[PDB]
């Protein structure tokens, strides 16, 4: 999907993701755009794998240096979006790191937590099972 | 449920059946009133006037 125009870089990319998603659901929009990081493409893919948001397209212009991603928001047949308001955990200046012994379960076994423990993005259940802890990236439920 | 002839100056988050029918332009509103009558007419097993014509009565308001 050709952009036909490059988006402008935010102060930080995860906050760009949050702002774009929240203003899309606020303005009744279905498509969101964000920068493309291996971390960020991984987090978007793992959000898709848990039924939170729709198709994602990674757009590379001429190199991995200029890479973005456009993803559609999931919309259930009841017109209710699966995105109940995304939040970031790896906050600049509020970087919260939880060990394997401190991996929580989102609102008592209802939501999904995104944890990059030691090798890549892992959901909450596999992170508990893998006996490996690490960074918690974002909360979507 | 609500059925209304929404206009572009109105809001579409208020009616349970949003239909883009203009009241400033009578060609939509007259047609819709006649067809709403005809729906319950054919529901009551009586002869039906419209809703099968390619172009019904031109009731253009001055």
């Amino acid at each position: 999907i050709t952009t036909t125009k490059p988006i402008k870089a935010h102060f930080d990319p995860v906050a760009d993701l949050l702002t774009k998603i929240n203003n899309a659901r606020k303005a009744k929009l279905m498509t969101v755009t964000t920068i493309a990081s291996k971390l960020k493409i991984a987090i978007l893919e793992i959000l898709v794998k848990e039924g939170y948001l729709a198709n994602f397209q990674v757009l590379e212009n001429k190199s991995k240096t200029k890479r973005i991603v456009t993803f559609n928001l999931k919309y259930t047949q009841r017109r209710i979006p699966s995105i109940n308001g995304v939040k970031q955990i790896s906050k600049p200046g509020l970087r919260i790191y939880r060990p394997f012994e401190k991996l929580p379960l989102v609102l008592n076994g209802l939501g999904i937590a995104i944890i990059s423990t030691s090798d890549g993005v892992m959901t909450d259940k596999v992170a508990r099972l893998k006996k490996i802890g690490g960074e918690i990236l974002a909360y979507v439920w | 449920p609500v059925v209304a002839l929404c206009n572009t100056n109105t809001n579409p988050e208020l009616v349970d059946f949003i239909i883009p029918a203009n009241n400033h332009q009578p060609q939509s509103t007259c047609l819709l009133m006649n067809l709403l009558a005809d729906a319950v007419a054919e529901a009551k097993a009586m002869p039906t006037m419209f809703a099968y014509k390619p172009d019904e009565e031109i009731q253009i308001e001055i």
Partner: peptide, 23 residues
């Protein structure tokens, strides 16, 4: 141009019908 594609998503057509039926 795109690089990935996964999980096609569709929804109902944009005409609200309350309860879908009243028969």
């Amino acid at each position: 141009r795109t690089e990935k594609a996964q999980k096609p998503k569709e929804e109902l057509w944009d005409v609200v019908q309350k309860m879908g039926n009243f028969d």
